[PDB]
Design a protein around this ligand. Structure first.
Ligand SMILES: OC[C@@H]1O[C@H](O)[C@H](O)[C@H]1O
Ligand SMILES: O[C@@H]1[C@@H](O)[C@@H](O)CO[C@H]1O
Ligand code: NA
Ligand code: NA
Length: 330
């Protein structure tokens, strides 16, 4: 049946989270996390999120029937992975499709791997090792207008970004949260231009600066605005929009800049807090309308780790500002 009409769950037969939506072959393909009721301990390191595979979803229209293409990748077939298949993303180049995914290696350190297919629906064959120089979580692979592809990535707390300040993992006894200096600039998300073959980074990883309207860095203590996880890039009017989750304050927010590397100036809220702790989204144009894909814990009755994806229309103003969405008003 058709789905996505009135902010209802897009699928109910499985739990789904962290929707990354793309337009490939005139369809919307969605690359979400596949939530399962593992019943593992819930804590601020995210051990309750113990996902083990990915299903690709597609829609020919919004609203529309949602197709579940089955298991596109299973952790049992990823040679380097130990546990926890978290939020993935996809890219298309020269007739090949690339699924990028964060997972903990055998030493319990998050890395980002790639898997390859001839179809946007998968299934995908994983590379035997993760991307060299990758770390932390939540990749968003963005194809710019000029044909260059960039990976945005990172997540603090359980995503371990705060343990990579030196370019090497600081260890399991290092910070469980952030830099632990609230008066210093907050940790920024990461960016790297992708190699021509889409399997590696083409440059040393850069950190993105996010500033307030006065041009001052967003500080570590500013949990309402500072980067937590779920980086996403889209463009409107030639302007670059870095959006992201703030985590413990439960917002999707956005910041704007004039190039992929920033700096980005904080503008405001995309999505107010939902049912359940996490908030994760993507923003995509389809048939000349812009859509915000997101999730909540509504279908499971509020369980943090059993989510469902939803969609709603997103409105840019001509000046580039975006109207804030509150999830449960209409
Ligand atoms: O859903 C698993 C993790 O929680 C957050 O939603 C984050 O963005 C993702 O990697
Ligand atoms: O620290 C984790 C974070 O990595 C994300 O998974 C959301 O849940 C928190 O507990
Ligand atoms: Na994302
Ligand atoms: Na606003």
């Amino acid at each position: 049946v058709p789905r996505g009409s009135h902010m209802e769950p897009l699928v109910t037969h499985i739990y789904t989270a962290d929707p990354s939506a793309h337009v490939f072959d005139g369809k919307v393909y969605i690359y979400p996390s596949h939530d399962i009721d593992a019943g593992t301990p819930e804590n601020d390191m995210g051990d309750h999120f113990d996902m083990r595979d990915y299903h690709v979803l597609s829609m020919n229209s919004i609203p529309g029937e949602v197709t579940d293409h089955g298991v596109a990748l299973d952790i049992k077939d990823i040679p380097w992975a130990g546990r926890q298949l978290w939020a993935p993303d996809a890219a298309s180049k020269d007739g090949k499709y690339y699924l990028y995914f964060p997972a903990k290696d055998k030493e319990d350190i998050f890395r980002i791997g790639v898997a390859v297919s001839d179809s946007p629906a998968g299934p995908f064959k994983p590379e035997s090792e993760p991307i060299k120089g990758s770390y932390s979580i939540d990749p968003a692979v963005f194809k710019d207008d000029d044909g260059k592809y960039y990976m945005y990535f990172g997540g603090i707390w359980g995503g371990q970004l705060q343990r990579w300040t030196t370019g090497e993992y600081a260890g399991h006894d290092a910070s469980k949260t952030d830099l632990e200096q609230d008066d210093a600039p907050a940790i920024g998300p990461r960016i790297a231009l992708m190699s021509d073959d889409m399997l590696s980074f083409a440059e040393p990883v850069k950190e993105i600066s996010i500033v307030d309207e006065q041009g001052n860095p967003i500080l570590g203590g500013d949990h309402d605005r500072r980067f937590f996880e779920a980086a996403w890039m889209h463009k409107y009017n030639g302007t670059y929009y870095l959006s992201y989750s703030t985590g413990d304050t439960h917002y999707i927010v956005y910041a704007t800049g004039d190039n992929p590397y920033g700096p980005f100036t904080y503008r405001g809220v995309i999505l107010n807090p939902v049912i359940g702790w996490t908030n994760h989204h993507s923003i995509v144009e389809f048939n000349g309308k812009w859509y915000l894909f997101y999730h909540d814990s509504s279908l499971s009755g509020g369980k943090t780790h059993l989510r469902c994806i939803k969609v709603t229309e997103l409105t840019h103003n001509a000046d580039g500002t975006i109207e804030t969405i509150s999830p449960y008003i209409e």
